Each structure stands twice: as C-alpha cells, then as structure tokens.
Design a protein around this nucleic acid. Structure first.
Ligand code: MG
Ligand code: MG
Ligand code: MG
Ligand code: ZN
Lengths: 153, 196, 205, 52, 190
RNA sequence: CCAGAAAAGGUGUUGGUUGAUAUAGACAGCAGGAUGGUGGCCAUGGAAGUCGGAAUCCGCUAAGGAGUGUGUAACAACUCAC
C-alpha cells in the first residue's frame, strides 16, 4: 500500500500540541514516534514554519522537508535564533546577496513551479522584500538591474 | 494604461503573425486559468498560445491586410472565445499534445454537466465523521472498517443537467470529477489553407 | 452647560474683544489651530482646499474645534498621519455675554463673559487643508464632513494657489526656477528687485 | 427537516431583502432608494439581518 | 423637454389575429381572446402592414413620465400575445417545516382550500380569478400549477394564495412556510 | 408690513457646470476565467486575501488585488476589482 500525507510543523522544537494524532491514529501507527522525528530531521531550520510531506505505507512514513520560497530565504538570513520565550517583532533586516538567491531560485526551478531562471530570480527577489530583507537595496533597487544588466542563465 | 496596453497588443499580434505562418484557431471555452497556464508553460518551447478581444483581433488583422491579403480567411473564423496557437514545429504532434494535455477539472457548483456523473458502489476512505455530505443526497451508506461503504451505484448528475452546490462537494471529496475541459480546436490556418 | 448656539449666531453687537476692559473671559477651547505635518516644506504639499463661509454669522470657538477634530480624524484615516496640513484660519476674539437669572429682573443688565466667538464675513476661508495633488477628493470629503459642525452655510473651494501661499500654482515652480521666491517652511519669501545688490549676489552665489 | 432549494425559495421572499434605515420598510434586494414617500425616497438602506 | 416622437413596433406572429377598436385591443389565437382597453394611456395604436404583421404605438409630444408608457403598452401586448399562443403556467411550491400544507382543489380549478398551515385549524379558502385553473401537479409531490391566458390574473391568483399563507407575530426569517411562486413559464412551449 | 418654519435629504421632475469611456466596440444584462511563488513577512490559541501593523513585488498572462464583500475556530464554498 502507498499513501501520502502532509503536515506543517515548526522546525527544531518538538511541538507538544499534537497535530499528529488526528492524522496518524486512524491511519494506524503511533504519532508520537513520528512527530518528534520530524523536528530533529528538520533540525537546521530550527525556528520557523516548515511544511513536511510524509509518504505513509503499511510499515512507516518517510520524513523529508518541502521547501518554501519564503522559508529558504529566511533560513539563509542567519540571525541568532530566539528560544521559546517568543518576544516581539523579529522583523528581518540584514544583508543577503545575489548568488545564494540564485541558488534558492535553483530549488524553486527544479520544483517545476516556475518559469525560466531569469524570471524565478525576479519572483524570488520579490520574496526578499516580502520577508523584509535587503540586498543592500531590495527589489526597487533591483528593478532596472535585471533589465539589461542581468546575471542569469 | 489601457490605451498603451491596446497599442502594445497590436504590436505583439503583428509580430506573432509576421513570424509564424502556421496557426490553430482553437476554442478556449471554459478552461481554467491554471489549466491554461499548465499547457502554455508546458508547450513554451514548442508553441505560443494567444488570446484577446476578438473584435480587437479583427482590426489588428485588418491593419496587416495592407501587406498579407491571405489573412482574410481568419476573419469569419473568430467567433466566441477562440484564440491562436502559433508554432513552427509540427502539424499533428502538437495537435495530439493539445488533445492529451487536457485535465479533468473539478465539478463546479453550477456548471452544466457534459457527461453522466455517477459513483461506483464502493468503500471510500472518508470515515464515519463525514456522513452528512451523503445524507444531503440521500445515499444509503454503511460504515465498515472505519470508512463509508456506498451500497449501490448512484446516478446523481446526468448529461445536460445543472450541477448543484450540495451534490458537487461529494465529487470533490471523493476526488472524482468527470468534467475534462481542454482545447477544442476547430479551424487550422497553415500557409493560407484551412482544414478541420 | 452653555445655551444653544442658535442664540449667539448673528453678528449683532460691535466686536467686543478680550481686552483690558472685558476681563475674566473664559478661554476658548480651540487652542490648536494648525496641525498635520505642519513641519513641511512648500514643495511637497501643493494642493489646497478651503472651506469658505457663505453667511455673515458667528462661528463658536467650540464649533471650530469640533470641525477641526472632524476634519483631522478623516484624513488620519485617509491620507496617513503625515500627508496633510489643516490650518484653521479663524481665531475667535469676540467674547459673548450672558445675563443669567438666579429676583432682580432686567434691571442692571450686562452679561458676564461666557464664551468666545468668531465673526465671519461673506466669502471667507474658515479652514484650509494642503496635501498632495493626488489627495484631492480626500480634501473635498474631509471639508464636507467638517461642514456639518458649523451652522449656516459653507461651500468648498479648491484654490489656484500653491498651498498656503499667495502665489499661483502655474507660476510657483516657474518663479522658484527663476529664483524670485525662496522656500522657508510653510511659506515662501518673495524677493523683489529692490534690495541692496549684495542680497542679489548672495542668492545668485 | 426542510430541503435547501426550498429554504432558498422561501428566503428569497422572506429573508433576502433590503430594509430601509428610516421608515423600516421592506425593499427588493437590488435596491438603492426606498419606495416609501414617508421617508422622502431616502438613500441609506441596510440588508435584512440573517438568522443564526 | 417634449420629444417630438417615440414609437416601438411589436411583431405579432402568424397565428395571432390581432385587431384594435380605436385604442382597445383584441388579441385572438389558439387559446382564446384577450381584451384590454388602454383608455387611460393617450397614444396612437396603429396596426400597420398588410397581412397585418405589426402593431405600432406612437406617442407625440411626451415628456419622460409619459414616454415611459410606450414599452409598457408593448409589453402588455406581448404578454397578451404570449398568453394566447403559449399560455401562462405559474408553478408554485408549498414550503413547510413541520406541518404539511394540505391543499385541495374545488370547483374544478376555481377554489383552493389550504389546510393544516402551521397546524392551524382555520382553513384558507381562496377563490381564483376568472380564466385561471388551479391544479395539483403530478410527478412532483407538493406543487400547484396555475394556468391561464391573462398574466395579470394568473399572477394575482398566485399572489392571493401566497399571501394567504403567512405567519403572524413570529420571526418570518425562521418560520419560512407557505406557498411561494417558484417557476414562471408558459403552458405549452416552443 | 403680515400673521408661520430650519439644518438635513429625494434614481420625482426640469435646467446648468465640470470631468471621464465608447466601434481598437464600452454602460448594463446573461455566460466563461478570476492563477503561481504563497497558507507573502511580523504577530496570534487559531488568521491560509478577507479580525490587526507595515509592505505590496514579480512570473504566467487575454486577466486576475499579497485582495472589494459574504463566510469559516482556521480553512473550504460563494462574490467583487481585472
Ligand atoms: Mg432648550
Ligand atoms: Mg446689542
Ligand atoms: Mg415572540
Ligand atoms: Zn425608506
């Protein structure tokens, strides 16, 4: 038998609020065995919202991470991660630069939810000011650079 | 604005008829936006599909009839939501790709039914918590193995009937919807020649 | 507390201001007269709309503040918190009097100071808002809903002047480029061809 | 207890109306001005409060 | 502003024999005759064309409050043609929450007794209009069919039996019972 | 004079000012779409376009707002701009 389920877990810390039982119990297996392994299998995400597919069979599910375009950029902005004390307004300044943006656009490209890569870097540079980031100047600084001075494939 | 949008559309339909001397006049009736995005992005290396105001394509072609008089045969064949497929690749391979890329759409809550929607008598995977969506149609159900067994076949939506909003939801949650809508090509333009 | 404003409406008496002779006047409750982003240059709020009275009447100092709050509260919703400048251009000076009864009667009749009022001539700018030229209907609607706080009759007129200046909008940037008037905040300074020549040199240097 | 297209047939005649702010009268759903001369053909309407 | 002339022709079909006695029209065809005098309306009704194929209503020197009465006349003539070619079938359905609305038809289509509406013991006897035949339809469980020639008689005899079934002193938004007009079609079709 | 009315309104009707869009086919009206990154970032117990604060991009486009409204615990489902 072969099935697939989805769950949007929270990164590094194992969620005590069991969103695991009402989707694993009527499928048959133990949910507490699996939902703690999702968080350590993510591991390096460690603070954020992360969607995870799990193909589930008669024996066990398989834990691998679904990428998100707003999540891959904010794991690349490497700020000191806050613990569970959960303060204010973590609004994301800082500097990311163009090469790893192209490298995230690689993963959005081979997701095959995309156009060609000169368009994917534009629609993922829009996510930079969505999150609030700053490539020493965000997509208003990057309007007319990709028009006739592109670094594309 | 809208004036320069129309004037740019004139240019991007003038050059797309000056480039490709081979066309499909294809009906884009009731296809989804994403169901056209899939076909458009998939055939991007091997086709260019185009839409627009048909009463604008009339004058956009009559601005070319200065130059190429063989485009006059396109004018009586633009009625309804019909558009262009432009290519220099094939004559029947991309035709079969247009025939094969059509997707079974979900059952809309108010669309007309082209074909005889019925459900086979089976044990679904919904579970006992979701019987009230079958009770709204009056389906005699039975709970077995923690799911729902539909006991007999149900002729719920027939050919040429309105699809109700209540009886469209159980098609979505049984994940079967026979409404396959795609491209319905009827007129071919190839080097000043028309075939069905 | 105070008697209805249909009593103290028409400009009946002589203008009787708060002065050395009339003392003990209670303070008019309008005390902020202009607000918004009042700390701005002339270049960035061109457009200006005036609420112009069309009756020779008296507007109370309480109605002035009511209409000011009503015209401010609309544009902090509409134009953002720093996209306008209200200037109320009627400071109240005429103090009005009250003969209150407790039985003496009408004998010895001269009122105590009750409130302050603003005598408004025919065709006079009561309030004026400057903003961007894209916020034109916001000025129109803000002044419209501030009309209902005043008595009488007001029209709404969008002027041809650049903001809160006495110079026309089609000539303002021309004269700035000709260096005939120089910005100094809410307004401008007009330079004539009359000064000593070192002041000409200092602006052309 | 009642079937849904019948309750929709009933509530297009009973519920799905406009009601005028002044005079409290009952108007057709695509109304902009009241019918009654008693309110001066006024302009401010509301929909009928749906049942819960 | 007085406009100088407004007009609007009405194509009468082949089988309809229409005539007009001054301003009073008579429309004849398969199902019967309808007469409706327009002696309040102050226009020029002219039956132009030989083979007599069009009626034409003229209004000379009319402001808009009386120019509004041109397509009114045209629509009454068109509903007068329709009710003699095709007829007027208004189907209307009895919606009931708990107590069944028991409708019985008496005097071969001319009287409707409505019983058990909200469990009440008062019975609604509603007389129809002369020319309208009420019936309980087969192949549908609780549906009344009102058929006739005059649309102002069919619809009024529908609205009478619809306003005979109303609640009193209760939330009309919840007690959604009564007979309500569901479908407004023709008797025979084309 | 002088013997009674106002602010405020009206898709009643008649004039008048000013600005739009419209055979590159509008306004209605009936039909078909109303997509992707994405369930955008902060936050919140839950907010997936729809309680909140700032942003508000791109791609595919004939065209679609990080959304006009009805909804939901949150979705879903419907609707609107286009
Ligand atoms: Mg009093
Ligand atoms: Mg005096
Ligand atoms: Mg009660
Ligand atoms: Zn009213």
């Amino acid at each position: 038998e072969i099935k697939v389920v989805y769950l949007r877990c929270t990164g590094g810390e194992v969620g005590a609020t069991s969103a695991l039982a009402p989707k694993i119990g009527p499928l048959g297996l133990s949910p507490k065995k699996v939902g703690d392994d999702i968080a350590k299998a993510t591991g390096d995400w460690k603070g954020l919202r992360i969607t995870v597919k799990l193909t589930i069979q008669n024996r066990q599910a398989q834990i691998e991470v679904v990428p998100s375009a707003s999540a891959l950029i904010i794991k690349a902005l490497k700020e000191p991660p806050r613990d569970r004390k959960k303060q204010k307004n973590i609004k994301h300044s800082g500097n990311i630069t163009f090469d790893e943006i192209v490298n995230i656009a690689r993963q959005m490209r081979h997701r095959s939810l995309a156009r060609e890569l000169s368009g994917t870097i534009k629609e993922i540079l829009g996510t930079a000011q969505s999150v609030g980031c700053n490539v020493d100047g965000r997509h208003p600084h990057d309007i007319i650079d990709d028009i006739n001075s592109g670094a594309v494939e | 604005d809208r004036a320069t949008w129309k004037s740019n559309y004139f240019l991007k339909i003038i050059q797309l008829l000056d480039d490709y001397p081979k066309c499909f006049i294809v009906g884009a009736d009731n296809v989804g936006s994403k169901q056209m995005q899939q076909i458009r992005m998939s055939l991007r290396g091997k086709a260019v599909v185009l839409m627009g105001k048909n009463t604008m394509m009339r004058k956009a072609i009559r601005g070319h009839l200065e130059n190429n008089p063989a485009l006059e045969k396109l004018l009586p064949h633009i009625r309804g939501n019909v558009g262009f497929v432009f290519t220099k690749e094939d004559l029947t391979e991309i035709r079969d790709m247009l025939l094969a890329n059509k997707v079974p759409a979900a059952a809309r809550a108010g669309a007309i039914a082209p074909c005889e929607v019925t459900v086979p008598a089976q044990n679904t995977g919904l579970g006992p918590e979701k019987t009230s969506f079958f009770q709204a149609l009056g389906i005699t159900t039975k709970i077995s193995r923690g799911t729902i067994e539909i006991l007999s076949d149900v002729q719920l939506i027939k050919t040429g009937d309105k699809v109700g909003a209540s009886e469209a939801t159980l098609l979505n949650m049984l994940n079967i919807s026979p409404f396959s809508f795609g491209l319905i090509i009827q007129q071919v333009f190839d080097n000043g020649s028309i075939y069905n | 507390g105070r008697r209805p404003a249909r009593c103290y409406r028409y400009c009946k008496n002589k203008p009787y201001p708060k002065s050395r002779f009339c003392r003990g006047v209670p303070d008019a409750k309008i005390r902020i007269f202009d607000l918004g982003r009042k700390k701005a240059k002339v270049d960035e709020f061109p457009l200006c709309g005036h609420m112009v009275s069309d009756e020779y009447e008296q507007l109370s100092s309480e109605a002035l503040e009511a209409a000011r709050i009503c015209a401010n509260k609309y544009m902090v919703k509409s134009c953002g918190k720093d996209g306008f400048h209200i200037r109320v251009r009627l400071h109240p000076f005429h103090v009005i009097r009250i003969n209150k009864m407790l039985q003496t009667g009408m004998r010895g009749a001269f009122g105590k100071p009750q409130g302050t009022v603003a005598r408004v001539h025919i065709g006079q700018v009561i309030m004026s808002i400057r903003t961007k030229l894209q916020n034109k209907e916001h000025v129109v609607e803000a002044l419209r809903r501030a009309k209902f706080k005043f008595p009488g009759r007001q029209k709404i007129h969008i002027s041809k002047k650049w903001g809160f200046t006495k110079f026309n909008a089609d000539e303002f940037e021309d004269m700035v480029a000709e260096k005939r008037l120089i910005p100094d905040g809410c307004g401008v300074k007009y330079i004539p061809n009359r000064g000593p020549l070192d002041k000409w040199r200092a602006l052309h240097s | 207890i009642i079937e849904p297209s019948l309750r929709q047939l009933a509530q297009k005649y009973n519920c799905d109306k406009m009601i005028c702010r002044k005079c409290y009268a009952r108007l057709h759903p695509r109304a902009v001005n009241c019918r009654k001369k008693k309110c001066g053909h006024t302009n401010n309407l509301r929909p009928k409060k749906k049942v819960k | 502003m007085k406009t100088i002339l407004s007009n609007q022709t009405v194509d009468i079909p082949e089988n309809v024999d229409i005539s007009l006695k001054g301003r009073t029209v008579i429309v004849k065809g398969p199902r019967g005759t309808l007469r409706r005098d327009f002696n309040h309306i102050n226009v020029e009704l002219s039956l132009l064309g030989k083979k007599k194929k069009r009626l034409r209503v003229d209004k000379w020197w009319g402001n808009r409050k009386e120019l509004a009465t041109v397509r009114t006349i045209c629509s009454h003539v068109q509903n007068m043609i329709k009710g003699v070619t095709l007829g007027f079938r208004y189907k209307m359905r009895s919606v009931y929450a708990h107590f069944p609305i028991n409708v019985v038809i008496q005097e071969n289509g001319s009287l409707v007794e409505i019983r058990n509406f909200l469990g009440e013991k008062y019975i609604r006897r509603v007389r129809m209009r002369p020319g309208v035949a009420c019936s309980v339809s087969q192949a549908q469980k609780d549906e009344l069919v009102l058929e006739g020639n005059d649309i102002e008689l069919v619809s009024n005899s529908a609205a009478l039996i619809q306003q005979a079934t109303t609640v009193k002193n209760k939330d009309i938004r919840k007690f959604l019972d009564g007979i309500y007009v569901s479908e407004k079609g023709t008797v025979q079709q084309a």
